[PDB]
Amino acid sequence: SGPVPSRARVYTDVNTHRPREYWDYESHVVEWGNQDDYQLVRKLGRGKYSEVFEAINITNNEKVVVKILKPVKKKKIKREIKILENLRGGPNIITLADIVKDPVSRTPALVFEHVNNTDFKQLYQTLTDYDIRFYMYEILKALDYCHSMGIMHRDVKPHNVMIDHEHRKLRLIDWGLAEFYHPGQEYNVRVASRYFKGPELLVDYQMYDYSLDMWSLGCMLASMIFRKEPFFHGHDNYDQLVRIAKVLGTEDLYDYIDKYNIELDPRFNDILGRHSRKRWERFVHSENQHLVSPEALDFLDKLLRYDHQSRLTAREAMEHPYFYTVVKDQARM
Ligand SMILES: O=C(O)c1ccc(-c2oc3c(Br)cc(Br)cc3c(=O)c2O)cc1
Secondary structure, three states: OOOOOOOOOOOOOOOOOOOHHHHOHHHOOOOOEEHHHEEEEEEEEOOOOEEEEEEEEOOOOEEEEEEEEOOOOHHHHHHHHHHHHHHOOOOOEOOEEEEEEOOOOOOEEEEEEOOOOOOHHHHOOOOOHHHHHHHHHHHHHHHHHHHHOOEEOOOOOHHHEEEEOOOOEEEEOOOOOOEEOOOOOOOOOOOOOHHHOOHHHHOOOOOOOOHHHHHHHHHHHHHHHOOOOOOOOOOOHHHHHHHHHHHHOHHHHHHHHHHOOOOOOOOHHHOOOOOOOOOHHHHOOOOOOOOOOHHHHHHHHOOOOOOOOOOOOHHHHHOOHHHHHHHHHHHOO
């Protein structure tokens, strides 16, 4: 048997046509700075891979953000650093300003730009229909760039999207799981938050591409327009696929399995059963109908697909009628 191979429909060989230095990050040499150039003000958040502090650049008295990294392989550190430097300057990509090492503890610390972030737990209450469309378009601009730069984020989630609603600014952060795309490469399925794990990550299909990020975005869009965060709320990875199967149906799931000859785990076939593909009207009620339109539902359906190749690309998504009002307003400046 063996699973059927896969290639990205867009930006397939962009990395092949680049210098080895670009994607071969194990050979990247980091230029460190002194963390005594920064004074920490307060902890902004914790996490599995880092603890994030607000800090001050004492050489110019300007607010920055210090991400003190948790002990991971040196390889993964170089990967995140190289990717950040490669994507630096891109649309709504977080800006890496410095890379310092504490003189005492000798720990790697990435220094980022400061953005007045309002948390989505309080932000998703003041968002209008236009606000959702607008910010979705902003994430797409960041995703289309990094995809065109041969990089998939592999960890798209609300926690990783900083938003300055007062200044309409958006930034895509945390690229510690991001990876360079190479046609034919089998990647680790152990990426992204459980609720945003694509079906390929759950059925153990390792040859995925940029389309993984498009799934996660779909989970964000579903959460926003239906006011259910998170939309696919599973208790583990096995149940996660079941929660997905209860919406998109088991019909397309087993066709997905059959097409790519994916050997399915002997546990799934006992908890999946059979389900019909529910219409998106079944998730529309009085409290969220002001966010749901035929344009909204059409755009969503074209993101949440088992077959990663049938999902929209970032650019294809940016040309959807769902963003027609946003595009016209951005052209008038
Ligand atoms: O690469 C990362 O993992 C990564 C994490 C956090 C920030 C990051 O977090 C903020 C938080 Br949390 C709260 C507030 Br207020 C501001 C920020 C901010 O400006 C900022 O860059 C940037 C990048």
